Amino acid sequence: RPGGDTIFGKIIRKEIPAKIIFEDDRCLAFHDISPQAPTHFLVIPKKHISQISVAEDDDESLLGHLMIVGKKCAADLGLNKGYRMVVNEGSDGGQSVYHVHLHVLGGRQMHWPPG
Amino acid sequence: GDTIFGKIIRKEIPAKIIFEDDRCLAFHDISPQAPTHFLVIPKKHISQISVAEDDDESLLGHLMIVGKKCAADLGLNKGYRMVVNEGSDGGQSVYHVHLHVLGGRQMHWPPG
Numbered sequence: 001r002p003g004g005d006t007i008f009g010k011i012i013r014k015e016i017p018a019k020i021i022f023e024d025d026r027c028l029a030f031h032d033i034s035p036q037a038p039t040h041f042l043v044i045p046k047k048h049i050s051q052i053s054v055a056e057d058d059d060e061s062l063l064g065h066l067m068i069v070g071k072k073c074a075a076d077l078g079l080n081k082g083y084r085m086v087v088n089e090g091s092d093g094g095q096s097v098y099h100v101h102l103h104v105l106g107g108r109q110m111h112w113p114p115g
Numbered sequence: 116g117d118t119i120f121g122k123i124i125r126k127e128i129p130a131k132i133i134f135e136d137d138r139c140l141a142f143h144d145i146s147p148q149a150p151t152h153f154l155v156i157p158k159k160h161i162s163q164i165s166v167a168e169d170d171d172e173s174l175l176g177h178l179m180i181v182g183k184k185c186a187a188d189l190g191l192n193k194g195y196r197m198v199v200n201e202g203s204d205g206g207q208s209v210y211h212v213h214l215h216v217l218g219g220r221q222m223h224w225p226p227g
């Protein structure tokens with residue numbers, strides 16, 4: 001079982017259903033089950049990294065790829081007034097699932113501060 | 116940069132710089148929304164994430180790695196939140212790509 005047994009590791013292996021927007025060899029984009037905006041989806045790596053604080057220097061282009069796929073998917077979903085990308089780390093960040101992920105939120109005016 | 120962040124990169128106006136290399140700059144935000152609130156920006160003028168190019172991928176990744184290393188250095192051991200805003204709905208305040216890093220308090224949900 002590559003990808004770990006977080007919920008996200010099981011989504012990667014098609015063991016748990018999700019609404020997938022995009023998939024390649026490096027990552028998977030899918031709609032969030034508790035959306036905080038009219039559009040709210042996640043971009044995750046297939047490589048299991050628990051959290052951004054433990055990402056390796058060599059994980060640089062993978063993290064970049066999450067953001068490139070994020071902005072491409074946002075455009076494909078017609079978020080043409082903009083969006084907010086979020087990564088949460090640890091307890092103060094509110095991280096609930098310990099597999100690195102990028103949130104993309106849009107379809108309404110996002111406020112400041114960002115929580 | 117024909118933005119204020121351009122002026123910061125060119126060292127034309129003050130900012131409290133945390134880290135610099137050949138391709139990015141990290142500095143404390145002038146209007147902080149947490150006890151720690153800093154930015155990591157590329158030196159290359161990418162106006163917004165929507166127009167980033169495919170071969171900017173390792174650079175964008177570099178911002179996040181530099182951000183997580185600065186976070187650790189600044190003592191954000193209980194965690195943090197990273198944010199990139201795009202466009203008017205996103206609340207993007209400067210048309211030069213920037214990664215926010217906020218910590219030192221509980222960050223809430225939703226994220227704005």
Ligand SMILES: Nc1nc2c(ncn2[C@@H]2O[C@H](COS(=O)(=O)NC(=O)CCc3c[nH]c4ccccc34)[C@@H](O)[C@H]2O)c2nccn12
Nearest residue numbers: 007017018031032033034088093094095096097222223224
């Ligand atoms: N599609 C789908 N999505 C799922 C499933 N399980 C979890 N998610 C999604 O993963 C995200 C984790 O982000 S995160 O920062 O780790 N977790 C958070 O929960 C951050 C937000 C948060 C919650 N309470 C807080 C309190 C303070 C600050 C932030 C928060 C959340 O937005 C979840 O809704 C699931 N199972 C089958 C299909 N599924």
